[PDB]
């Protein structure tokens, strides 16, 4: 058996059923075998219907087209970045603060 991960629409894989589309919550999505984490929103990107999915400067996933119903959805990561604290010396007090 021969397999290849070519840039082609997915045809043959498991019989696992799909679910209802959900928006405004960042989750893990399995769109035609593409694994990624992000929020699904309505996309303003409108192009000629001849390409499956697109990329960006970062060579990541930003545009998707599910084959069941042809609409374009937007992908962007949710909250990220480091977190720091605000505190004085521990000899005086322990009143600390959280900075985002």
């Amino acid at each position: 058996l021969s397999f290849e991960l070519l840039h082609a629409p997915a045809t043959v894989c498991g019989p696992k059923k799909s679910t209802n589309l959900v928006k405004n919550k960042c989750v893990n999505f399995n769109f035609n075998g593409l694994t990624g984490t992000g929020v699904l929103t309505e996309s303003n990107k409108k192009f000629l219907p001849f390409q499956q999915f697109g990329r960006d400067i970062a060579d990541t996933t930003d545009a998707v087209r599910d084959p069941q119903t042809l609409e374009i959805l937007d992908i962007t990561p949710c909250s990220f970045g480091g977190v720091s604290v605000i505190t004085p010396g521990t000899n005086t007090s322990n009143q600390v603060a959280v900075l985002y």
Binding site: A58, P77, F80, G81, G82
Partner: peptide
């Protein structure tokens, strides 16, 4: 702002983090 640095400001123009200056 004085107009000279106004003109100079107009002339001069994802896991990363860009901290703002102090």
């Amino acid at each position: 702002r004085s107009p000279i640095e106004d003109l100079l400001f107009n002339k001069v123009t994802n896991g990363l983090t860009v901290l703002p200056p102090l």
